[PDB]
Amino acid sequence: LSNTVLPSESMKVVAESMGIAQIQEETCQLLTDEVSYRIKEIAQDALKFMHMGKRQKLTTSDIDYALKLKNVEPLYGFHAQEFIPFRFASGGGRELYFYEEKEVDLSDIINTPLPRVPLDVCLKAHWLSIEGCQPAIPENPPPHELSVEQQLYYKEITEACVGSCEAKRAEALQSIATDPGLYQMLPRFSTFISEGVRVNVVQNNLALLIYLMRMVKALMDNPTLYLEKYVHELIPAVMTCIVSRQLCLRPDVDNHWALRDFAARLVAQICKHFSTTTNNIQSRITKTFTKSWVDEKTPWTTRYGSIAGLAELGHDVIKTLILPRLQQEGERIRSVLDGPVLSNIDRIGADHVQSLLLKHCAPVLAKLRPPPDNQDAYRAEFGSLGPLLCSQVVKARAQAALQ
Amino acid sequence: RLKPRSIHELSVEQQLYYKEITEACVGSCEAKRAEALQSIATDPGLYQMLPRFSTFISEGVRVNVVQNNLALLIYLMRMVKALMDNPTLYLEKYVHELIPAVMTCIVSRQLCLRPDVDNHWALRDFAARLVAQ
Amino acid sequence: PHTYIKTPTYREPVSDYQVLREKAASQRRDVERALTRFMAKTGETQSLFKDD
Amino acid sequence: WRYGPARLWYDMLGVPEDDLLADENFLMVTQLHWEDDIIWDGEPWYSIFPIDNEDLVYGRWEDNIIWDAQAMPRLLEPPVLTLDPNDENLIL
């Protein structure tokens, strides 16, 4: 890309060593390009010796062989073992580096003890591999802070969460409910649940999310711990399970729908415990369910979670949101009745949405309709809510007989 | 990595002022209660202290349900009227807490002898019905 | 003044040495007890009292 | 943090780093039954709390939840935790 040459100022310093007071700028450039070109030619020749005779260290001897090949005089003292010495003095605003070589007595060199004699070259035979993988021989190559008790307990809780042992998880949930001193571990617990939900988007596993939801429920069970400070982290993680388009790798095979109602119930329970009028946590939660259900071109699983959430938060919440969108259920049923592919997963998802919708509609419909509910079917879209309302009226009569 | 301690949005002096208004509202002195009602009506700054005021009335009402305090209940209704009249505060946002408290006062059984407190009981029901509508 | 007055006061930390010592001791005892009980539930155990 | 809380999820990854929309519709009064709330002497203690978590008071937690798996603003990330502790009744 860009050629590299020694600095022109360095060439001027060499001219000053020669005793030439003034050197032309072109002359400095002319000197540097030629010397660098010679350096590259010697370096490539030394590299050829280094490749031909295995070394890889670019030893000084290879450079000396290159100097002999050029026919230029060999440099002296480089073969002798030495270290790189640079000494810098600012002085009168002048930058210079010097060897500062020390002086040694000749007798001292004689005094130094003789080094060990070098061994003559020998050949050793060993099996690198025997009919397969290498055998194991020496010649072959061998290959704010949690308390110590709290950290050990937290590690045990994480092992219960993985699901390696169901019994360990059950004991942990019972212990969490009965443990007064969960302080300083509560931020860690909330972080663990949120990170597991983040793992779910990358790899969809229904079981892992169910384990996390049970862990959140255990925290709610224990009165001594307070989640009001850590509730903000928990609400998105629980919400993600309710409105995720895919909760499992295979939607039809795994019953993610059962988790969606449970996750919606958990979100309703968590908001109720720490609800504040200024925070309006329930109002935001109702709005998120309403926007997802109202939006068109939304996956059935997300819509199913939204319908379940509105019912869990309150009976009144179903009356305000479900009754206006009852007409949508009739439009959805038309898609279930007629579709290009019978086996399509979307029809099964719409059918799950239909069953949840009619069940939620029946208590509100029974309140707004007479016990016979003859006209309830006409009021309902496709009559699904009206049939459910008639069943709800029969259930109410059975409850009255029981009482 | 400790974060700096969070501070309440309401000014400490404003919280002290809210405490003084609630003490006047208890009805121990008629003049203090009347002054507190006038202050709530004429103070724009009183807005944003309404959640604390609504909670204080609700806590007083629930204790009043356990042992009837009809005279105290009437004083709490006077505070409720003062909060409702002031324009700056959003009464509708905190109305959900207020409605159960007014309903319980109207239907509450009288622990005190009925003839002695009958005049107060009729006034308490009249105040509750007006605020509820 | 209160209508336009603004006063900032930070949350006050407990200034009692006794309460701080009690809080640390109580939390440590509860967490260590919870860990030992959980280990006994998930591990083979020997009881000083028979069937206990 | 790789070695911080929720490390087990990081270990699994193996990462090497370190009309209905009206405000009135959602109003609490519409969604709450008043008579149930009253104790009515049948067989609280709040708003005296020092402060409410600031992130909850105005923070939009709604953005974090992912509506569609196929399209995401961000994919899996190291997501190092803030590791900042607050709350009350704390030794430090």
Side-chain angles (χ1 to χ4, degrees), chain D residues 18-62:
Chain D
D18 205 8
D19 297 338
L20 283 328
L21 271 309
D23 298 352
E24 139 72 29
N25 277 174
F26 320 115
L27 236 38
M28 299 292 100
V29 30
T30 75
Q31 315 169 331
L32 184 83
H33 182 260
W34 313 299
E35 284 213 334
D36 286 353
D37 215 354
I38 332 172
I39 60 167
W40 268 355
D41 293 357
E43 286 83 26
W45 185 64
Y46 274 125
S47 287
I48 326 288
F49 56 79
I51 9 90
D52 227 335
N53 197 272
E54 200 183 33
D55 188 27
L56 196 59
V57 187
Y58 334 91
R60 231 198 107 90
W61 46 266
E62 314 104 69

Coordinates of all heavy atoms in Angstrom, one line a residue, chain D residues 18-62:
Chain D
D18 N -15.1 -10.8 28.4 CA -14.9 -10.7 29.9 C -15.0 -12.1 30.5 O -14.0 -12.8 30.3 CB -15.8 -9.7 30.6 CG -15.3 -9.1 31.8 OD1 -14.1 -9.3 32.1 OD2 -16.0 -8.4 32.5
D19 N -60.6 4.1 19.9 CA -61.6 4.1 20.9 C -61.1 3.3 22.2 O -61.2 3.9 23.3 CB -62.9 3.5 20.4 CG -63.5 4.4 19.2 OD1 -63.2 5.6 19.1 OD2 -64.3 3.8 18.5
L20 N -60.6 2.1 22.0 CA -60.1 1.3 23.1 C -58.8 1.9 23.6 O -58.4 1.5 24.7 CB -59.9 -0.1 22.6 CG -61.2 -1.0 22.5 CD1 -62.2 -0.5 23.6 CD2 -61.8 -0.9 21.1
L21 N -58.1 2.8 22.9 CA -56.8 3.4 23.3 C -57.0 4.6 24.1 O -56.0 5.3 24.5 CB -56.0 3.6 22.0 CG -55.1 2.5 21.5 CD1 -54.3 1.9 22.6 CD2 -56.0 1.4 20.9
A22 N -58.2 5.0 24.5 CA -58.5 6.2 25.3 C -57.9 6.0 26.7 O -58.0 4.8 27.2 CB -60.0 6.4 25.4
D23 N -57.3 7.0 27.3 CA -56.7 6.9 28.7 C -57.8 6.5 29.7 O -57.5 5.8 30.6 CB -56.1 8.3 29.1 CG -54.9 8.7 28.1 OD1 -54.5 7.9 27.3 OD2 -54.4 9.8 28.3
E24 N -59.0 7.0 29.5 CA -60.1 6.8 30.4 C -60.4 5.3 30.4 O -60.7 4.7 31.5 CB -61.4 7.6 30.0 CG -62.7 6.9 30.0 CD -63.2 6.6 31.4 OE1 -62.9 7.4 32.3 OE2 -64.0 5.6 31.6
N25 N -60.3 4.6 29.3 CA -60.5 3.1 29.3 C -59.6 2.4 30.2 O -60.0 1.4 30.9 CB -60.4 2.5 27.8 CG -61.7 2.7 27.0 OD1 -61.7 2.4 25.8 ND2 -62.7 3.2 27.7
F26 N -58.3 2.8 30.3 CA -57.3 2.2 31.2 C -57.3 2.7 32.6 O -56.5 2.3 33.4 CB -55.9 2.3 30.6 CG -55.8 2.2 29.1 CD1 -55.4 3.2 28.3 CD2 -56.1 1.0 28.5 CE1 -55.3 3.1 26.9 CE2 -56.0 0.8 27.1 CZ -55.6 1.9 26.3
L27 N -58.2 3.7 32.9 CA -58.3 4.3 34.2 C -58.6 3.3 35.3 O -59.4 2.4 35.0 CB -59.3 5.4 34.2 CG -58.8 6.8 34.6 CD1 -57.4 7.0 34.1 CD2 -59.7 7.9 34.2
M28 N -58.0 3.4 36.5 CA -58.2 2.4 37.6 C -59.6 2.3 38.0 O -60.1 1.2 38.3 CB -57.3 2.7 38.8 CG -55.8 2.7 38.5 SD -55.2 1.1 38.2 CE -55.1 1.2 36.4
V29 N -60.3 3.4 38.1 CA -61.7 3.4 38.6 C -62.6 2.5 37.7 O -63.4 1.7 38.3 CB -62.3 4.9 38.6 CG1 -61.7 5.7 37.5 CG2 -63.8 4.9 38.6
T30 N -62.4 2.6 36.4 CA -63.2 1.7 35.5 C -62.9 0.2 35.7 O -63.8 -0.6 35.7 CB -63.0 2.2 34.0 OG1 -61.7 1.7 33.6 CG2 -63.1 3.7 33.9
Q31 N -61.6 -0.1 36.0 CA -61.2 -1.6 36.1 C -61.3 -2.1 37.5 O -60.9 -3.3 37.7 CB -59.8 -1.7 35.5 CG -59.6 -1.0 34.2 CD -58.2 -0.9 33.8 OE1 -57.3 -0.9 34.7 NE2 -57.9 -0.8 32.5
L32 N -61.7 -1.3 38.5 CA -61.7 -1.7 39.9 C -63.1 -1.8 40.5 O -63.9 -1.0 40.1 CB -60.8 -0.8 40.8 CG -60.6 -1.1 42.2 CD1 -59.4 -2.1 42.3 CD2 -60.4 0.1 43.1
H33 N -63.4 -2.8 41.4 CA -64.7 -2.9 42.1 C -64.5 -2.3 43.4 O -63.7 -2.8 44.2 CB -65.2 -4.3 42.2 CG -66.5 -4.5 42.8 ND1 -66.6 -4.8 44.2 CD2 -67.7 -4.2 42.3 CE1 -67.9 -4.8 44.5 NE2 -68.6 -4.5 43.4
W34 N -65.1 -1.1 43.7 CA -64.9 -0.4 45.0 C -65.4 -1.1 46.2 O -64.6 -1.1 47.2 CB -65.6 1.0 44.9 CG -65.3 1.7 43.6 CD1 -64.1 2.1 43.1 CD2 -66.3 2.1 42.6 NE1 -64.3 2.8 41.9 CE2 -65.6 2.8 41.6 CE3 -67.7 2.0 42.6 CZ2 -66.3 3.3 40.5 CZ3 -68.3 2.5 41.5 CH2 -67.6 3.2 40.5
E35 N -66.5 -1.8 46.2 CA -67.0 -2.5 47.4 C -66.1 -3.6 47.9 O -65.9 -3.7 49.2 CB -68.4 -3.0 47.2 CG -69.5 -2.0 47.2 CD -70.8 -2.4 47.8 OE1 -71.1 -3.7 47.8 OE2 -71.6 -1.6 48.3
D36 N -65.4 -4.3 47.0 CA -64.5 -5.4 47.4 C -63.3 -4.8 48.2 O -62.8 -5.4 49.1 CB -64.1 -6.2 46.2 CG -65.2 -7.2 45.7 OD1 -66.2 -7.3 46.4 OD2 -65.0 -7.8 44.7
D37 N -62.9 -3.6 47.7 CA -61.6 -3.0 48.3 C -61.9 -2.6 49.8 O -60.9 -2.8 50.6 CB -61.2 -1.7 47.5 CG -59.7 -1.5 47.4 OD1 -59.0 -2.2 48.1 OD2 -59.3 -0.6 46.7
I38 N -63.1 -2.2 50.2 CA -63.4 -1.8 51.6 C -63.2 -3.1 52.5 O -63.7 -4.1 52.1 CB -64.8 -1.2 51.7 CG1 -65.3 -0.5 50.5 CG2 -64.8 -0.3 52.9 CD1 -66.7 -0.1 50.5
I39 N -62.5 -2.9 53.6 CA -62.4 -4.1 54.5 C -63.8 -4.5 55.1 O -64.1 -5.7 55.2 CB -61.4 -3.8 55.7 CG1 -61.8 -2.6 56.5 CG2 -60.0 -3.7 55.1 CD1 -61.0 -2.5 57.8
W40 N -64.6 -3.4 55.4 CA -66.0 -3.7 56.0 C -65.9 -4.5 57.3 O -66.8 -5.3 57.5 CB -66.9 -4.3 55.0 CG -67.7 -3.2 54.2 CD1 -67.7 -1.9 54.4 CD2 -68.7 -3.5 53.1 NE1 -68.6 -1.3 53.5 CE2 -69.2 -2.2 52.7 CE3 -69.1 -4.6 52.5 CZ2 -70.1 -2.1 51.7 CZ3 -70.0 -4.5 51.4 CH2 -70.5 -3.2 51.1
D41 N -64.8 -4.3 58.1 CA -64.6 -5.1 59.3 C -64.8 -6.6 59.1 O -65.4 -7.2 59.9 CB -65.5 -4.5 60.4 CG -65.2 -3.1 60.9 OD1 -64.2 -2.6 60.3 OD2 -65.9 -2.5 61.7
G42 N -64.2 -7.1 58.0 CA -64.3 -8.5 57.7 C -63.0 -9.3 57.7 O -62.0 -8.8 57.1
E43 N -63.0 -10.4 58.4 CA -61.7 -11.2 58.5 C -62.0 -12.6 58.1 O -62.3 -12.8 56.9 CB -61.1 -11.1 60.0 CG -60.5 -9.8 60.3 CD -61.4 -8.7 60.8 OE1 -62.5 -9.1 61.3 OE2 -61.1 -7.5 60.6
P44 N -52.9 -1.2 52.0 CA -52.7 -0.6 53.4 C -51.3 -0.5 53.8 O -50.5 -1.2 53.2 CB -53.5 -1.6 54.3 CG -53.4 -2.9 53.6 CD -53.6 -2.5 52.1
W45 N -51.0 0.3 54.8 CA -49.6 0.5 55.2 C -48.7 0.9 54.1 O -47.5 0.5 54.1 CB -49.1 -0.8 55.9 CG -47.7 -0.8 56.6 CD1 -47.4 0.0 57.6 CD2 -46.6 -1.6 56.2 NE1 -46.0 -0.2 57.9 CE2 -45.6 -1.2 57.1 CE3 -46.3 -2.5 55.2 CZ2 -44.3 -1.8 57.0 CZ3 -45.1 -3.1 55.2 CH2 -44.1 -2.7 56.0
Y46 N -49.2 1.7 53.1 CA -48.4 2.1 51.9 C -48.6 3.6 51.6 O -49.5 4.2 52.2 CB -48.5 1.0 50.8 CG -47.5 -0.1 51.0 CD1 -47.9 -1.4 51.0 CD2 -46.2 0.2 51.1 CE1 -47.0 -2.4 51.2 CE2 -45.2 -0.8 51.3 CZ -45.7 -2.1 51.3 OH -44.8 -3.1 51.5
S47 N -47.7 4.1 50.8 CA -47.6 5.6 50.4 C -46.8 6.3 51.5 O -46.5 7.5 51.4 CB -49.0 6.2 50.2 OG -49.5 5.8 49.0
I48 N -46.3 5.5 52.5 CA -45.4 6.0 53.5 C -44.0 5.5 53.1 O -43.0 5.8 53.8 CB -45.8 5.6 54.9 CG1 -47.3 5.4 55.1 CG2 -45.2 6.5 56.0 CD1 -48.1 6.7 55.1
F49 N -44.0 4.8 52.0 CA -42.7 4.3 51.5 C -41.8 5.5 51.1 O -42.3 6.5 50.7 CB -42.9 3.3 50.3 CG -43.7 3.8 49.2 CD1 -43.1 4.6 48.2 CD2 -45.0 3.4 49.0 CE1 -43.8 5.0 47.1 CE2 -45.7 3.8 47.9 CZ -45.1 4.6 46.9
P50 N -40.4 5.4 51.3 CA -39.6 6.6 51.1 C -39.7 7.1 49.7 O -39.8 8.3 49.5 CB -38.2 6.0 51.3 CG -38.3 4.5 51.2 CD -39.7 4.2 51.7
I51 N -39.6 6.2 48.7 CA -39.6 6.6 47.2 C -40.1 5.5 46.4 O -40.1 4.3 46.9 CB -38.2 7.1 46.8 CG1 -37.1 6.9 47.8 CG2 -38.3 8.6 46.4 CD1 -36.4 5.6 47.6
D52 N -40.5 5.7 45.1 CA -40.9 4.6 44.2 C -39.7 4.5 43.2 O -39.0 5.5 43.0 CB -42.2 4.9 43.5 CG -43.1 3.7 43.6 OD1 -42.6 2.6 43.7 OD2 -44.4 3.9 43.5
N53 N -39.4 3.2 42.7 CA -38.2 3.1 41.9 C -38.3 4.1 40.7 O -39.4 4.0 40.0 CB -38.1 1.6 41.4 CG -36.7 1.3 40.9 OD1 -36.4 1.6 39.7 ND2 -35.8 0.8 41.7
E54 N -37.3 4.9 40.5 CA -37.4 5.9 39.4 C -37.6 5.3 38.0 O -38.3 5.9 37.2 CB -36.2 6.9 39.5 CG -36.4 8.2 38.8 CD -35.3 9.2 38.8 OE1 -34.1 8.7 38.7 OE2 -35.5 10.4 38.9
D55 N -36.9 4.2 37.8 CA -37.0 3.6 36.4 C -38.4 3.2 36.1 O -38.9 3.4 35.0 CB -36.0 2.4 36.3 CG -35.9 1.8 34.9 OD1 -36.1 2.6 33.9 OD2 -35.6 0.6 34.7
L56 N -39.1 2.7 37.1 CA -40.6 2.4 37.0 C -41.4 3.7 36.8 O -42.3 3.6 35.9 CB -41.1 1.5 38.1 CG -42.4 0.9 37.9 CD1 -42.4 -0.1 36.7 CD2 -42.9 0.1 39.1
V57 N -41.1 4.8 37.5 CA -42.0 6.0 37.4 C -42.1 6.5 36.0 O -43.3 6.8 35.6 CB -41.5 7.1 38.4 CG1 -42.5 8.2 38.5 CG2 -41.3 6.5 39.8
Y58 N -41.0 6.7 35.2 CA -41.2 7.2 33.8 C -40.7 6.3 32.8 O -40.9 6.6 31.6 CB -40.6 8.6 33.7 CG -40.5 9.4 35.0 CD1 -39.3 9.3 35.8 CD2 -41.4 10.3 35.4 CE1 -39.2 10.0 36.9 CE2 -41.3 11.0 36.6 CZ -40.2 10.9 37.3 OH -40.0 11.6 38.5
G59 N -39.9 5.3 33.2 CA -39.2 4.4 32.2 C -40.1 3.6 31.3 O -41.1 3.1 31.8
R60 N -39.8 3.5 30.0 CA -40.6 2.7 29.1 C -40.1 1.2 29.1 O -39.2 1.0 28.3 CB -40.5 3.2 27.7 CG -41.9 3.5 27.0 CD -41.8 3.6 25.5 NE -42.2 2.4 24.8 CZ -43.5 2.3 24.4 NH1 -44.4 3.2 24.6 NH2 -43.8 1.2 23.7
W61 N -40.6 0.4 29.9 CA -40.2 -1.1 29.9 C -40.8 -1.8 28.7 O -40.3 -2.9 28.4 CB -40.6 -1.8 31.2 CG -42.1 -1.5 31.6 CD1 -42.5 -0.5 32.5 CD2 -43.2 -2.2 31.2 NE1 -43.8 -0.5 32.6 CE2 -44.3 -1.5 31.8 CE3 -43.5 -3.2 30.4 CZ2 -45.6 -1.9 31.6 CZ3 -44.8 -3.7 30.2 CH2 -45.8 -3.0 30.8
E62 N -41.8 -1.1 28.1 CA -42.5 -1.8 26.9 C -41.6 -2.0 25.7 O -41.8 -3.0 25.0 CB -43.7 -0.9 26.6 CG -44.5 -0.4 27.8 CD -44.3 1.0 28.2 OE1 -44.7 1.9 27.5 OE2 -43.7 1.2 29.3

